[PDB]
Design a protein around this nucleic acid. Sequence first.
RNA 1: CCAACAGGGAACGUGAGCUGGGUUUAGACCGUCGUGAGACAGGUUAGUUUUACCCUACUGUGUGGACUGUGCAGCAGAUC
RNA 2: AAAUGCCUCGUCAUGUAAUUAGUGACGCGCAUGAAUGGAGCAACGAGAUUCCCACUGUCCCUACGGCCUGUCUUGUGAACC
RNA 3: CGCGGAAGUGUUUUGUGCAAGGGCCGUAAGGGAAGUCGGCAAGAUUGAUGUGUAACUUCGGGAGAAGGAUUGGCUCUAGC
RNA 4: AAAUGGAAGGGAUUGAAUUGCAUUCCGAUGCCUGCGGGGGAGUAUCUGAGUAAGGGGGCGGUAUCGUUCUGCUGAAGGUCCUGCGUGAGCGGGGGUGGAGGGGCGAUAUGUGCAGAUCUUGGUAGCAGUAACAAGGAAAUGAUUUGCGCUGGACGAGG
RNA 5: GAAGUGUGAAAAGGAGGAUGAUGAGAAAUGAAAGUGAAUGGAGUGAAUGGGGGAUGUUCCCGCCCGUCUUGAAACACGGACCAAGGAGACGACGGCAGGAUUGUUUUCCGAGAGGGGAGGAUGCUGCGGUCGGACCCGAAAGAUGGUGAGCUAUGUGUGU
RNA 6: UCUCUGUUCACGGGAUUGAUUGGCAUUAGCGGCGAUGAAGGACGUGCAGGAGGACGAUAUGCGUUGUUGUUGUGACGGUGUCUGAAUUGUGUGCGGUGUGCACGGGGACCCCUUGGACUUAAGCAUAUCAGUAAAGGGAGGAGAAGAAACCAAAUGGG
Lengths: 86, 174
Amino acid sequence: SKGTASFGKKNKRNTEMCRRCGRQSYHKQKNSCSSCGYPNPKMRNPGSIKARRRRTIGTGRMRYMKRELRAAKNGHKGDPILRTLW
Amino acid sequence: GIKYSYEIHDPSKAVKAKIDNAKVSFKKTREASCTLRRRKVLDAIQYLKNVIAKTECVPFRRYNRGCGQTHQARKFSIPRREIVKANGEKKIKKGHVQTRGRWPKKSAEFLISVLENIKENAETKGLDPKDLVITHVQVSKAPKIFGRTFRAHGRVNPFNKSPCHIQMVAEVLG
RNA sequence: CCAACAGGGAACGUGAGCUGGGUUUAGACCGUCGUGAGACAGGUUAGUUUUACCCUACUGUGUGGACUGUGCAGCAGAUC
RNA sequence: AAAUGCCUCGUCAUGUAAUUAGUGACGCGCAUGAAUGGAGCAACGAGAUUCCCACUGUCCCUACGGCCUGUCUUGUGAACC
RNA sequence: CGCGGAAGUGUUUUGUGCAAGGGCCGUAAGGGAAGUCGGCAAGAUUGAUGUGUAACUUCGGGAGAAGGAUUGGCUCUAGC
RNA sequence: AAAUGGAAGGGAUUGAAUUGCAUUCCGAUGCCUGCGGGGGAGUAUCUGAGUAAGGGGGCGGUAUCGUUCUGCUGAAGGUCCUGCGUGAGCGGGGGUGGAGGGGCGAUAUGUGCAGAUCUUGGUAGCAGUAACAAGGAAAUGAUUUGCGCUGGACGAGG
RNA sequence: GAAGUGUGAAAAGGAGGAUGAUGAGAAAUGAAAGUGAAUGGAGUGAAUGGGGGAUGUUCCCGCCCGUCUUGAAACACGGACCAAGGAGACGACGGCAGGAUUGUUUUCCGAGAGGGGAGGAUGCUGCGGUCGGACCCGAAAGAUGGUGAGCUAUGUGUGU
RNA sequence: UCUCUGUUCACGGGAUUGAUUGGCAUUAGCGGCGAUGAAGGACGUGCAGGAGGACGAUAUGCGUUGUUGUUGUGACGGUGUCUGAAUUGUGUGCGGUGUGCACGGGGACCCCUUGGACUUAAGCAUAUCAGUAAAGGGAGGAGAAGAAACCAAAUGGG
Ligand SMILES: [Zn+2]
């Protein structure tokens, strides 16, 4: 009875949503995410060659880094009001 | 859509009707129509209503492997003939006794719909629906529609439908 | 007991006909052999038998009166 | 001559009309034997064996009957090769 | 528990009437394991209450040993 | 003296299955003789089977530079009919189609398919077959009657 | 860890059927496998092919290809059918052949100690050799770095 | 009628021809993130809205300046929920209780540490693959190196 009949017992859930990366891979009995490695301060080394291009710089929105790149083409002049103090 | 394969000469005396992608079995519908040509339009509607009541049968001639036998099918037998001078020489041709028939009854409702459209198109052109003769019937294959079914040992196989197209032309043989 | 209880062939006729006692992987016991893992045509016990709806063959059935002739094929009684 | 004996269906007795089976007795035992445990069966066993009573379609030799399938209709409509 | 009933809940209204062969069952003259590797399968015993119970034995058991008998309905009597 | 009914190849044959003969006849892509085509050879000629393998001459895909042409008065592709070539292949005619397409010399190659239990896509036969469904009824069906046994709450999971 | 691009110059317009309108055109092109309708011919022989003749047949010849093998029609293996894709190209170093330009070319023997005059160079194309994924497709394994006790096994806390 | 085979019209499927706001390669420049809160994640924002894209409670966009009268747009500046190194923390410098700095992201190329086996030797153990792959720590537009306790044996180089 290790086949069909054993599948009817699988109603416990070991994981929850991770608060760093958002996958269903934060193991609650272990206190550890298997994707990103939270709560270690550094992020985990990816497990495959393709895994590196699914979550990196550029696969999200880049809300601040785009702005900074437009400012470095013009010498980083800031708000025209505050320019008197500087 | 689908075009007619019949060339209608003298278009003042003819009537036409169609159905594309009809949700009915192609093989059963093609047998039910194989005795309709050269019948009167009103006698082909009564013949298809007796098929639903099971007092006349449809002869099964091409797609008929392992069909039931019945006494109503002997009305479509081919008689023994004499074929004189094939190429200057006389020969003899035995007959065939039919023996196989059935009563489809969902193909018969679809063919009654097409025959009713031809009867209401003759009114607009003002000609007598008791003088129409069927001169053309054709049943063709339409594209498949996909489905599935479950087999033992965790397997899946195809489980599909086979629809068809239907055309008709009727004429006054004055 | 009987008249008598002859000998053989047909993929050592015949497992999508059956049965599975012999043989019979994976469990186990004994004897002998080997330091050992193990060995023995030595003995013992427990051990899944799948699928025809196709072609042909064969059995019937169908392939359009009444009374008959005559060709072909089959073939039966044996023993006390 | 035992789940251990090659020769081997060992030899004698007993159960049968008839016993390569079973049980009792014999022993130079290819290769029985003492915690490698020997001898030993009260109680317990879906363990392995042989016989007796009872009982029966297991068989002599098959018959008749029930329900669901198959045979016949409509709908839905695969696969192996 | 089994063999039957409530409560609550679920349910349709123009297929045939039953060849052979299957799956699950019932009844069988006379014989009674001759069947088969092998009593496999089926049949048989079965509740309760008097009666009557062997060898052996670790004295506790064996034992519900084995073997024999009685049983419905109705109308009353006796005990607490 | 052997196991399905069977073999001078068969029907047959008293010499049409034995022996000895030749004065006749039939019979190859072999031989002789007249033309045609290829390859050698010192140019009056001689000589052609072929697996594994090696050499010579040709046909075809896509582009470049390099020259020389054609298409809306209808190109390529596709389909039917027809000419030329031993062949690989190359032309013309009539429909369809609605925008581009070639010749010749050198040069660059992801350069020619029937097979690999080849890869991906589409489609047959098997076959209207196997399998599954058709639940008790009453012209009507908020009414009458027949059958089955889970029925009601909390958690996990959705 | 996929599969999927196209009405037309213009929406000028369709989308059950029939009757129609617009447009240069009903509207990208539209092969094979396979099928329906009509009409001509043939058949009860498995079919298909070559020669020779003819609006089907009549005479002769003809077993299914590819492959491994001494040897295949094989009771040897792969192959139901059609389209498209699908395998000796490229780099380095050396040799030889054919071809191009130029030619006033050469550091020898011997372990050493010692001894001592005798047409190539630089490109281009092809073939043979070696190492490179190395003509194409195919193991049982080995190592480095990570994931799992929601099935199942044992211990322990708290309930039924 | 059925089976096989001619012809014409209609299906079925998506090959072929021609296009292309996509891919691929070589070359020249640049190599511009973070406690002044990054990269990444979650949830929200349009009068009538799902996906995508865009945006942050100043939310389907605001200000200045140029070009426009438009479904308007270019160049620059401001804002940016709740999270995440995520820190009201831990270590440490200077002061003497004030004020700094480090942490994470990325890692093709560079510096330091650690360190295989497949494979070749027609077997295999030293050897080879190779101090290479994988792993870890630390930097930049490059890094590392660098001004002889050198090379040599000449009429010496630097
Ligand atoms: Zn995470």
